[PDB]
Amino acid sequence: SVKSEYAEAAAVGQEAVAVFNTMKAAFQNGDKEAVAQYLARLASLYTRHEELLNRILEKARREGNKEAVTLMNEFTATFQTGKSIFNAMVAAFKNGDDDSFESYLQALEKVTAKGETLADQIAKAL
Ligand SMILES: FC(F)(F)c1ccc(OC2CCNCC2)nc1
Numbered sequence: 001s002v003k004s005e006y007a008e009a010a011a012v013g014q015e016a017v018a019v020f021n022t023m024k025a026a027f028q029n030g031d032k033e034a035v036a037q038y039l040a041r042l043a044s045l046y047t048r049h050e051e052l053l054n055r056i057l058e059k060a061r062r063e064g065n066k067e068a069v070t071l072m073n074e075f076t077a078t079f080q081t082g083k084s085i086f087n088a089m090v091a092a093f094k095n096g097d098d099d100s101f102e103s104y105l106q107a108l109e110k111v112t113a114k115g116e117t118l119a120d121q122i123a124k125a126l
Contacts, residue, residue: 009052016045068125
C-alpha cells in the first residue's frame with residue numbers, strides 16, 4: 001500500500017540522517033577521505049528518497065486523496081530546499097571552503113528538523 005511505501009521512504013530518510021550525523025563527526029575530525037565517501041552515500045540516499053516521495057505523491061493524486069496530496073506537495077517542496085543546500089555543501093567540500101561547509105551543514109539540520117512534524121502528518125494522512 002501507499003502507507004507501506006511511505007514507511008520504506010521514511011526508513012531511507014532516517015538512514016541518510018544516520019549517515020549525515022556520522023559525516024558531521026568526520027568533518028569535525030578533519031577526516032576528509034571519510035567525508036567524501038559519506039557525501040557520495042548521502043547523494044544516493046537522497047536521490048532514492050526523492051524518487052520514492054514522487055511515487056507516493058503520484059499515487060495519492062491518482063487515489064484522489066486531497067489531504068495527502070496537499071501535505072506531500074508541501075513536504076516535497078521542503079525536500080527540494082534541503083537538496084539545494086546539500087548540493088551547495090558538496091560544492092563547498094570540493095572547493096575546500098570549510099566556513100561554507102559548516103554553514104550549510106547547520107542549515108540542512110534546521111531545514112530537516114523543521115520538516116518533521118509534517119513528515120509525521122503525512123504518515124497519518126495516506
Ligand atoms: F542530509 C540529510 F539526510 F537530509 C540530513 C541532514 C541533517 C539532518 O539532521 C538531523 C540531525 C539533527 N538535525 C535535524 C535532523 N538529517 C538529515
